[PDB]
Amino acid sequence: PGFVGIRFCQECNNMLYPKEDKENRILLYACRNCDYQQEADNSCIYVNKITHEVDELTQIIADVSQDPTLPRTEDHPCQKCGHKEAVFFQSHSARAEDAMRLYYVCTAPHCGHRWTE
Amino acid sequence: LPHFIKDDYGPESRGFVENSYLAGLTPTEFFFHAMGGREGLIDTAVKTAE
Amino acid sequence: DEITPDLWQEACWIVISSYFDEKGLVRQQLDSFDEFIQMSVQRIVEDAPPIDLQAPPRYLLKFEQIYLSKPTHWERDGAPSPMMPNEARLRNLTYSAPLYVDITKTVIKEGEEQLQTQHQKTFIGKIPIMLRSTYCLLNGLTDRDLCELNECPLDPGGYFIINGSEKVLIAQEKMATNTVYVFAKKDSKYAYTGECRSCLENSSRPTSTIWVSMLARGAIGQRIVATLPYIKQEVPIIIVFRALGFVSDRDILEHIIYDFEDPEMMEMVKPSLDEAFVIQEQNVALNFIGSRGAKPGVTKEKRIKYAKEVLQKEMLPHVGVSDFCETKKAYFLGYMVHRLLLAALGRRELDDRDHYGNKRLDLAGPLLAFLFRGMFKNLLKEVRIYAQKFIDRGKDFNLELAIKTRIISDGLKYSLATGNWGDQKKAHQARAGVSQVLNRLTFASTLSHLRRLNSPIGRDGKLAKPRQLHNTLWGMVCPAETPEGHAVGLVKNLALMAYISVGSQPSPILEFLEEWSMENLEEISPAAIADATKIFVNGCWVGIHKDPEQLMNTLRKLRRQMDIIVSEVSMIRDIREREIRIYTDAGRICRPLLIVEKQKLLLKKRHIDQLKEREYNNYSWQDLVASGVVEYIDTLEEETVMLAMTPDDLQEKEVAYCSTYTHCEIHPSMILGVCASIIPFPDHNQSPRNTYQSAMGKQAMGVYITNFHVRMDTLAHVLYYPQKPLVTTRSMEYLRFRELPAGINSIVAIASYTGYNQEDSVIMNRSAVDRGFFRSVFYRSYKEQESKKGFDQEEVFEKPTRETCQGMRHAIYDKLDDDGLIAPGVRVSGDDVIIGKTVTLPRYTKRDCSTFLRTSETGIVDQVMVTLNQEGYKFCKIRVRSVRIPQIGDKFASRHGQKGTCGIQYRQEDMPFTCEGITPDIIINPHAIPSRMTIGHLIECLQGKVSANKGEIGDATPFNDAVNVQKISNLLSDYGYHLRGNEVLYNGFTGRKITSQIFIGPTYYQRLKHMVDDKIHSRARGPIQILNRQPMEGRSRDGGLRFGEMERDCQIAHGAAQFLRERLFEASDPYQVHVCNLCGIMAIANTRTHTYECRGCRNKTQISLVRMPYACKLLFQELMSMSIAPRMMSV
Amino acid sequence: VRPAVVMQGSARNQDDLTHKLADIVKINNQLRRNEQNGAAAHVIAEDVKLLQFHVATMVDNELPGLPRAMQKSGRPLKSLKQRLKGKEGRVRGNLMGKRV
DNA sequence: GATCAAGCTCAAGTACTTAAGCCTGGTCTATACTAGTACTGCC
Ligand SMILES: [Zn+2]
Ligand SMILES: [Zn+2]
Ligand SMILES: [Zn+2]
């Protein structure tokens, strides 16, 4: 499914609101300021992920490997480059109760590989 | 404390004083014990009014 | 090259000694006042606007420079003379220096008639000077010069003298400014609130607080609003952005959300957009703001202008108040909304209000600067009104007569005298508690007071969160030193190596950042903010960067090289959020730490060598910091710092814990404060005990200062024979406790003897007391002056006489001299007269207003001093001396919270004794040890027995693995004693051995100012108050004890009604009134002429006597004053 | 109920109630003359408003919205209500519990 | 029989009262503008 992104007008750069062509019964994104219209391409106008199926690997960034306060381990090498050393940390993010899962990052420079056991 | 690492839930990091008074408390243990003492002092100085 | 573990214990303490030999103990106070005098005052003078006044001719009155001379005093003859602090303490003067400002008045009328007039060094006011500061006369003087000047070389300074009273400014805590803090209140209409107390870098002290909240989910979505200053109604963020000139919604999102690839962010910001879309122009948005503004929008034009200037001046002033900065304000408000969204989506943690990295300490510098700003504003106001009402008459005006120097002078004097921090009239907007009287009871008390902190949370608050010892107080504040009353956790004390930053200008840092690859905030495109790292300077978002790793490495190298970045500057690189917060603000509590590069310390052995020969090679702590071996780390950077407790942690272990340390502790005992550093083996006691000791060390007698014979203090306790503790911590050498000790090493025996020490009590040796054990002297100073307030009545010192004076008490006045002052060496008892003062009246023509001794004092006159006060009237100070021998009831306390009163005093013949003739000076009850867990007390007694038998000073440094109980026991077994300190004792009454071998040894005890002679009180029909005929309040007034409500309730439970009546009626305020039997109102009775009548009822026969308390009669009269008719119906 | 005690010197200091009654009598006399002689009634109005504020602040100073009756140093007066409001008052401070 | 008006009930918002006891010391106490009030040189 995936979320639904905002579409902006090309004249005033304002947000396009969803609307239907009553005669043709087709979804359009029309501007609430000027008279611009666009033919929708997703057909979905709203998506709310209540279960919050978020992959924290996307929130993690390679720069976290430069943190000296994080623990390092040699037992989990990096699969993308083979580097042995890697930092590991918890999610520590709200809305994630099962935060005891460990997320690893490769300490090698220019690799920044992220993964999870 | 800054002496520990992030996401450290070990007894020492979380304030488990493994030393006895006679043995002496390591500085971190001392600080955590001071925290607990603070808690007791506040409770004693607060309950009175109510 | 590397310091080996065996040499580390000496090297770290060498470094610590160099630190305290260079900085000192009150360095934060001295540096704050210095920075205030060099920078704050001059900046406030430049920051004041030139007052343009015109009838045509006009005048600008621009100030340009300041000059602060040394402290001086002008007598009535007017000759400027140098005033010493001792002279101020004696004459009750104010140790202040005059402030001379250069003024330029330009006259511009017409016809090219322009001319400048310069008034050099115009006396604008007096500023009180902090003792030992740069401008103090005691600056740079040697210890011998101070001794010649009758000053104590150990006196740290850091305090003012107002009317001869030593005042010390307590550092006030406040939430950091110019930083965004996203909190979440559980019970409120808002889920998350991102606030920002904004303030100009170095001006406009009022911190315009701006809130950006999110409406609670409970409506289509969650709306974002902003509580702007000077507006009493919340406003959606979109209107604010459009009012700033960003009308396109795409531009708004580009300023708020930096990553359009975050559909969660778009979905979270959508409700506010959909809620505020009808407005699409800047003028409409500004009109909306002006319509919501506190000021009424009489006209849309004014309304719009009102807003425009609010959004330009009040909203986020730290970002900029000039014009064309709407882009900067928009970016900052966007970042604020971004922070609110990150908190709402949970990707970021809420900010902790107790994190001291988020707090700032307002020291004397910023406090005096705030007062000076407000008072200089009031001065320019008075000068404006004066010049206006003179030019209105069409004539020139003299600025010398316009400048009311009394404003600044009396203002600073009043604030530092009373503590009400603010205008003299604004006694409610001002916060009290600042500028307390310096405690001079002992040197430790003085130091702690000069290193005291204050949290303005309010003692009435019952929330424990601000009182809790937060983790961030490590190394910055003493975990033990805190009051145990209603201010637990609120009043704190700095740690030994803690230094509060003074402040610095960020201009050089900004220039360095621009010189590197940073891009300014207006030059970049919002597309570049996604991956780039944000860079803040003092909370102002300046720009972005691409390689923050090497940027931080460079900034750190510069700070470690004392380059453009000074050591007090903080540099925290948040990695998860991709930001680099740089701080130069003042009040940032920080401490020094040893840099660790690989897993090895930069403090090599050559450094210890140079610090050992510190007196020859002039290699000091400053050179050690400049060598890049030490670094000042603040609480906010400790989050990003990985400390190594000791060099042992840097070694390779069987399992590597960190292996990536970046800093190291100089010594863990530095986490303790001043009154806690004196505790031996504090790591062997329960923390409450260490807190009680930190609170009593300030109450212990000793030698509060060397020139105590010169100081005429109101209350002073001096111990006859102070001794340095046999069991000493390595921090006392820096507290100078060895030079001004506050106790005596006592041969204490922990035993049950005659049960006269039970329930936390002690038995003293009468023979030791007879030999001067804990004997002390109490000095009390009485001050008085002759005021010539008016020709009707004048006061004068003169021996009163019965035939001329009227109000002469029955005490004899023969002890006085004809001058009216008693002479030294004279024996004086309670109610005796010491200053014979008479005031002329309008038994005739003069009333006695002499100064008597406080009741039940019984001292001897130590000395008498006579001088002239500021007004040139005669002023006398009489210091009376009373020798206090320790007796039953006096409080004594060890250094472990083991406090107690002397239960009884047994003679040396009656006290127990060892096989040798050693009786214990004190006997304490063993029951005081188990519950309190003061194992440090027993270890102190053991190390003390070993020190006394070995001829050395035991090292009781808190965290020292080189000294344990087994080593101490072995050393004690080497001198022919039981290894555990026990010893066979013999009953002093019978000589029989005691079945249980008692524990005995030297322990350092202290005598506390709480004697029984100063607390014993009694009353039997003494004086009473005036409003209600009830006993007075206090021993000084011979007052009675209060029979409170709880006592009334207890006697009710006992059912003793006669007793309750005696206590509440017959023993307090028995009274009689006459009431009318008809209306029950108090009638008019005249027992002399036996006539009783009620004017209301016109009757004079139906009157009745009623026995009621006077307070009851007064209550009924107070009700009749409120038109209530309480009718006492006796039938 | 309002004893005029002498301060540290000899000048007789008046009680807070005395000062408030003095203000009340000042505005009362002013209004009485302004009604005895035609004063346009505008001043009469304003006078009655000020008299009401004085009478109110005499028995109760903690008026919500209205300014607190001030005295020397800017301190609020101790109204009759504050004299027996709670702790340290007449009822709890001098009748239920008192010095003995 | 349907619609409108009046009355009753419920929910939300605003304002007012209380925050342990008793006990010991200390310090500090309105400017600010003003008119009159006397002095005192100046003539
Ligand atoms: Zn459009
Ligand atoms: Zn890798
Ligand atoms: Zn009657």
Tokens of C661: 């340390």
Rounded distance in angstroms from the CA atom of residue C1045 to the C1' atom of nucleotide E39: 65
Does C1122 lie at the interface with D, CB-CB under 8 angstroms? yes
Q: Which helix (H) or strand (E) holds C96?
A: strand C96-108
Tokens of C378: 């009031």
Report resolution (Å) to 1 decimal. Answer: 3.3
Could you give phi then psi for residue C674, rounded to 5 degrees?
A: -80, -55
Chain length of chain C: 1131
**Residue C963 to residue C729: CA distance in whole angstroms:** 12
Q: Which residues pair with C533 in a beta bridge?
A: C545
Q: Which residues pair with C327 in a beta bridge?
A: none
DSSP C38-73: IIIHHHHHHHSPP--EE---EE--EEEEEEE---EE
Q: Which helix (H) or strand (E) holds C181?
A: strand C181-183
Residue written as tokens 């710092």? C641
Are A72 and A113 part of one and the same domain? yes
**Residue C497 to residue C22: CA distance in whole angstroms:** 12
Are A78 and A102 part of one and the same domain? yes
Tokens of C457: 């949370």
Q: Do C1122 and D59 touch (CB under 8 A)?
A: yes
Pick out the residues of the known binding site of C: 1076, 1079, 1094, 1097
What's C374-419 look like in SS3? HHHHHHHHHHHHHHHHHHCCCCCCCHHHHCCHHHHHHHHHHHHHHC
Assess contact for D71 and C1095: CB atoms under 8 A: no
Are A42 and A74 part of one and the same domain? no
Query: 3-class SS at C766?
Result: helix
Q: Which residues are CB-neighbours of C912 under 8 A, at least 6 positions away?
A: C749, C751, C753, C919, C920, C923, C985, C986, C987, C988, C994, C998
Assess contact for C698 and C439: CB atoms under 8 A: yes
Tokens of C773: 């054990």
C252-to-A15, C316, C330, C540 alpha-carbon distances in Å: 11, 18, 8, 20
Residue written as tokens 């960020």? C506
Query: 3-class SS at C838?
Result: strand
**Residue C182 to residue C994: CA distance in whole angstroms:** 68
| Torsion sign over Cα C1111, C1112, C1117, C1121 | positive
**Residue C259 to residue C771: CA distance in whole angstroms:** 82
DSSP B4-28: S-TT--STTTTT---S-TTT---HH
- Compute the CA torsion angle A107, A109, A112, A115 (nearest 10 deg): -30
Query: 3-class SS at C113?
Result: coil
Does C51 lie at the interface with A, CB-CB under 8 angstroms? no
**Residue C116 to residue A108: CA distance in whole angstroms:** 69
Q: Which of B1, B3, B4, B6 to mutate to test the interface with A (most CBs of A within 10 A)?
A: B6
Are A22 and A53 part of one and the same domain? no
Q: What spacing in Å lies between the alpha carbon of C225 and ligand 1's midpoint?
A: 25
**Residue C171 to residue C365: CA distance in whole angstroms:** 10
Q: Which helix (H) or strand (E) holds C209?
A: strand C208-215
**b/e string for C179-190 if b means 16 or more Cβ within 10 A?**
bbbbbbeeeeeb
**Residue C894 to residue C745: CA distance in whole angstroms:** 10
Q: How many domains does chain A have?
A: 2
D3, closest residue in chain C (CA to CA):
C1027
Q: Which residues pair with C193 in a beta bridge?
A: C183, C213
Does A99 lie at the interface with B, CB-CB under 8 angstroms? no
Q: What spacing in Å lies between the alpha carbon of A84 and ligand 2's midpoint?
A: 8
Q: Give the count of beta carbons closer than 10 Å to the beta carbon of residue C1.
A: 6
Residue written as tokens 């966007």? C334
**Residue C820 to residue C784: CA distance in whole angstroms:** 12
Those nucleotides of strand E lying less than 7 Å from any protein Cβ are: 15-34
Whose CA is nearest the C1' atom of nucleotide E30?
D73
Assess contact for C811 and C839: CB atoms under 8 A: no
**Residue B4 to residue B31: CA distance in whole angstroms:** 13
Nearest by Cα to C254 from C312, C322, C327: C327
Are A32 and A56 part of one and the same domain? no
DSSP C1109-1122: EHHHHHHHHHHHHT
Nearest by Cα to C751 from C999, C994, C919: C999
Q: Which residues are CB-neighbours of C463 under 8 A, at least 6 positions away?
A: C457
Could you give phi then psi for residue C336, rounded to 5 degrees?
A: -65, -40
Query: 3-class SS at C291?
Result: helix
Assess contact for C663 and C595: CB atoms under 8 A: yes
Tokens of C829: 């008892």
Chain C hits for B3, Cβ within 8 Å: 643-645
Q: Give the count of beta carbons closer than 10 Å to the beta carbon of residue C970.
A: 12
Q: Which bin fits B39, alpha (ψ -120 to 50), beta or left (φ > 0)?
A: alpha
Are A57 and A91 part of one and the same domain? yes
Q: Which helix (H) or strand (E) holds C192?
A: strand C190-198
Q: Which helix (H) or strand (E) holds C268?
A: helix C263-275
To the nearest whole angstrom, how far is the Cα of A84 from the nearest Cα of chain B? 20
Q: Which residues are CB-neighbours of C685 under 8 A, at least 6 positions away?
A: B21, C679, C896, C897, C933, C934, C935, C936, C937
**Residue C781 to residue C783: CA distance in whole angstroms:** 6
Tokens of C858: 């019984």
**Residue C84 to residue C97: CA distance in whole angstroms:** 12
The angle at the Cα of C812, spanning C810 to C816, to the nearest 5 degrees, equals: 140
**Residue C206 to residue C203: CA distance in whole angstroms:** 9
**b/e string for C46-69 if b means 16 or more Cβ within 10 A?**
eebebeebeeeeebbbbbeebebe
**Residue A61 is part of a domain; what is its CATH number?**
2.20.25.10
Assess contact for C581 and C575: CB atoms under 8 A: no
For chain A, give me the number of helices (H) and strands (E)?
0, 7
The catalytic position among C249, C352, C354, C760 is C760
Chain length of chain A: 117
Are A37 and A84 part of one and the same domain? no
**Residue C1048 to residue C448: CA distance in whole angstroms:** 42
Q: Which of D59, D95, D96 to mutate to test the interface with C (most CBs of C within 10 A)?
A: D95
Q: Do C1121 and D10 touch (CB under 8 A)?
A: no
Q: Give the count of beta carbons closer than 10 Å to the beta carbon of residue C1062.
A: 16
Q: Give the count of beta carbons closer than 10 Å to the beta carbon of residue A60.
A: 21
Query: 3-class SS at C718?
Result: strand
Tokens of B36: 């607990």
- Compute the CA torsion angle A23, A28, A30, A36 (nearest 10 deg): -80
Which residue among A8, A32, A63 places its CB closest to the CB of C250? A8
**Residue C1056 to residue C3: CA distance in whole angstroms:** 77
**Residue D37 to residue D41: CA distance in whole angstroms:** 10
What's A35-81 look like in SS3? CCEEECCCCCCCCCCCCCCCCHHHCCCHHHHHCCCCCEECCCCCCCC
C297-to-C6, C237, C281, C529 alpha-carbon distances in Å: 77, 21, 19, 39
The beta strand positions in C1008-1094, using DSSP E, are 1042-1043, 1070-1076, 1084-1086, 1091-1093
Q: Which residues are CB-neighbours of C496 under 8 A, at least 6 positions away?
A: C20, C670, C672, C673, C674, C677, C731, C734
Which residue among C1043, C1114, C1121 places its CB closest to the CB of D100? C1043
Query: 3-class SS at C66?
Result: strand
Helices within C314-363 (DSSP H only): 326-344
Is A44 annotated in a binding site? The answer is: no
The angle at the Cα of C306, spanning C302 to C311, to the nearest 5 degrees, equals: 150
C602-to-A61, C132, C549, C592 alpha-carbon distances in Å: 32, 34, 21, 14
C80: exposed, middle or buried (C-beta count within 10 Å: 0-12, 13-18, 19+)?
exposed
- Pairing state of beta strands C827-828 and C859-868? antiparallel
Which experimental technique did the depositors report for determining this structure? cryo-EM
- C145 catalytic? Reply is no
**Residue C156 to residue C166: CA distance in whole angstroms:** 12
**Residue C439 to residue C445: CA distance in whole angstroms:** 6
Whose CA is nearest the C1' atom of nucleotide E27?
C418
Give the CA count within 13 Å in the CB-facing half-sphere of D27. Answer: 18
DSSP chain D: -----B-SSSSBPPPHHHHHHHHHHHHHHHHHHHHHTT-TTHHHHHHHHHHHHHHHHHH----SSSPP-B-GGGPBP--HHHHSSSTTSSIIIIISSEE-
Tokens of A45: 């106008």
Tokens of D69: 């009756």
Are A87 and A32 part of one and the same domain? no
Does C1028 lie at the interface with D, CB-CB under 8 angstroms? yes
Assess contact for C132 and C30: CB atoms under 8 A: yes
**Residue C960 to residue B30: CA distance in whole angstroms:** 13
**Residue A16 to residue A14: CA distance in whole angstroms:** 6
Does A3 lie at the interface with C, CB-CB under 8 angstroms? yes
Tokens of C488: 């637990």
**Residue C852 to residue C855: CA distance in whole angstroms:** 9
Q: Which of C786, C1024, C1068, C1071 to mutate to test the interface with D (most CBs of D within 10 A)?
A: C1068
Assess contact for C728 and C669: CB atoms under 8 A: no
Assess contact for C10 and C17: CB atoms under 8 A: no
**Residue C127 to residue C107: CA distance in whole angstroms:** 31
**Residue C1063 to residue C910: CA distance in whole angstroms:** 44
Are A116 and A82 part of one and the same domain? yes
Q: Which residues pair with C1082 in a beta bridge?
A: C1075
Q: What spacing in Å lies between the alpha carbon of A75 and ligand 2's midpoint?
A: 13
**Residue C1081 to residue C1092: CA distance in whole angstroms:** 12
Nearest by Cα to C3 from C734, C629, C668: C629
**Residue C981 to residue C967: CA distance in whole angstroms:** 13
Report helix angle C605-612 to C5-22, nearest 10.
50
Are A67 and A110 part of one and the same domain? yes
**Residue C120 to residue D35: CA distance in whole angstroms:** 60
Query: 3-class SS at C1089?
Result: coil
Q: For C990, which DSSP code?
A: T
**Residue C446 to residue C1010: CA distance in whole angstroms:** 18
Chain-centroid distance of CA C1126 in Å reads 50
Which residue among C1026, C1047, C1048 places its CB closest to the CB of D5? C1026
DSSP C427-472: TTTSB-S-SEEPP-SSHHHHHHHHTBEE-TT-TT---STTTS--GG
Q: Do C641 and B2 touch (CB under 8 A)?
A: yes
Chain C hits for D100, Cβ within 8 Å: 1031, 1040-1043, 1063-1064, 1067-1068
**Residue C837 to residue C362: CA distance in whole angstroms:** 45
Assess contact for C539 and C473: CB atoms under 8 A: no
Helices within C66-155 (DSSP H only): 85-91, 143-148
Report helix angle D16-36 to D42-59, nearest 10.
160
Q: Do A6 and C266 touch (CB under 8 A)?
A: yes
Q: Which residues pair with C195 in a beta bridge?
A: C181, C211
Q: Which residues pair with C743 in a beta bridge?
A: none
Q: Do D95 and C1115 touch (CB under 8 A)?
A: yes
Chains C and B physically touch (3 or more Cβ atom pairs below 8 Å):
yes
| Torsion sign over Cα C153, C158, C159, C161 | positive
Chain-centroid distance of CA C52 in Å reads 41
Q: Which domain holds residue A39?
A: 4-48
Does C1045 lie at the interface with D, CB-CB under 8 angstroms? yes
Are A76 and A35 part of one and the same domain? no
**Residue C477 to residue C1074: CA distance in whole angstroms:** 65
DSSP C840-853: E----SEEE-PEEP
Helices within C895-1004 (DSSP H only): 935-950, 965-973
- B&C contacts, CB < 8 Å: 102
Nearest by Cα to A60 from A115, A18, A16: A115
Assess contact for C466 and C489: CB atoms under 8 A: yes
Tokens of C26: 């009150």
Could you give phi then psi for residue C862, rounded to 5 degrees?
A: -80, -55
Tokens of B23: 């043995």
Are A19 and A70 part of one and the same domain? no
Q: What is the CA radius of gyration of chain D?
A: 17
